[PDB]
DNA sequence: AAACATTCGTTCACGTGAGTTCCAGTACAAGTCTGGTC
């Protein structure tokens, strides 16, 4: 029900997965995905899946997000 | 002295133009779904 992974750890795992895909290492990417699954909740894993697919369906335009940021 | 008109004077109903609120329709930007090839 409660996860324990921080944003920095998630970003590091995602970068490791990207390098693994570029490095032709299936075992390492599988291990990273297993760690992500075992150290996250249902909602966290759903959001991770959405981010991986690169389709969040937030409903807020990119320009609105950028304007809010600056 | 009585009747008519006239007049006339009024006032009420109806019609037209300008300001305000609301909503339908249109233009533009972005998200989202989908097509094929190497």
């Amino acid at each position: 029900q409660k996860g324990s992974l921080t944003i920095q750890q998630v970003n590091d795992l995602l970068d490791s997965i990207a390098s693994n895909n570029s490095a032709k290492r299936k075992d390492l990417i599988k291990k990273s995905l297993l760690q992500l699954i075992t150290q996250s909740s249902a909602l966290e894993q759903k959001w991770l899946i959405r981010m991986i697919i690169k389709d969040l369906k937030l409903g807020v335009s990119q320009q609105t997000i950028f304007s809010v940021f600056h």
Side-chain angles (χ1 to χ4, degrees):
Chain A
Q1 288 288 327
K2 179 188 206 62
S4 77
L5 283 179
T6 67
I7 281 175
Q8 199 209 38
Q9 283 172 47
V10 166
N11 279 335
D12 268 24
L13 287 154
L14 289 162
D15 289 53
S16 147
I17 285 150
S19 87
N20 284 189
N21 177 40
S22 149
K24 306 304 224 313
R25 304 304 323 280
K26 183 68 180 295
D27 50 358
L28 302 199
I29 178 173
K30 280 184 62 39
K31 202 205 211 162
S32 280
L33 260 288
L34 180 59
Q35 165 162 3
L36 271 173
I37 291 160
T38 58
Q39 291 193 324
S40 272
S41 173
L43 203 72
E44 290 194 9
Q45 287 179 200
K46 184 184 103 193
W47 280 120
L48 275 165
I49 291 152
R50 258 168 184 171
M51 291 163 187
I52 286 158
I53 296 330
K54 312 222 200 205
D55 167 274
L56 278 161
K57 292 277 246 173
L58 278 178
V60 75
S61 266
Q62 184 207 281
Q63 320 313 337
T64 305
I65 288 280
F66 272 121
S67 86
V68 166
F69 174 46
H70 208 277

